[PDB]
Amino acid sequence: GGNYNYLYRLFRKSNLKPFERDISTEIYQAGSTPCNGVEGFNCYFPLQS
Amino acid sequence: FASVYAWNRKRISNCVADYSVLYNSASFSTFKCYGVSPTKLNDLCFTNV
C-alpha cells in the first residue's frame, strides 16, 4: 500500500552548504508572485514522499 | 485544434523563445516540466523544439 512516511525535500532557494541541515516547511515560491502561505500555481509545498 | 489520434506536429526552429510568457500566464491548468524545471528554460539553448 505504500510507506508514505519517508519524505525528501525537492525545492530550495539555494544548494546546501556541506553538512548543513534544513527542516523548515515554508511554502516554496517558484514564480514572482508572492505566496502568502497558501498553495497554488508556482506556490508549492516543498516536501515529497 | 487537432484530433487526438492524428495530433499535429510543428517544428519550432531558430528564433528567440520566451517561455516566461508561457510559465506565468496563469491561464494554464497544467504546466509540468520533466527534463528541466520551468524557470531555467529562458537560460538554455537546444537544437530543435
Strands A8-9 and A47-48: antiparallel
Q: CB contacts < 8 Å between A and B, how many?
A: 11
Gap between the Cα atoms of A38 and B6, Å rounded: 40
Helix, strand or coil, per DSSP, at residue B21: helix
Plot region of A37 (φ>0 → left; ψ -120 to 50 → alpha; else → beta): left
- Resolution in Å, one decimal place: 2.8
Half-sphere exposure of A46 (CA within 13 A, CB side): 15
Phi and psi at residue A29, in whole multiples of 5°? -130, 100
Structure solved using which method?
cryo-EM
Gap between the Cα atoms of A26 and B28, Å rounded: 25
DSSP B23: H
A41, A43, A44: best mutation site toward chain B, by most B Cβ within 10 Å? A41
Task: Burial-class residue A42 by CB neighbours within 10 Å (0-12, 13-18, 19+).
Answer: middle
Taking the CA of residue B43 and the nearest CA in chain A, the distance in Å comes to 15
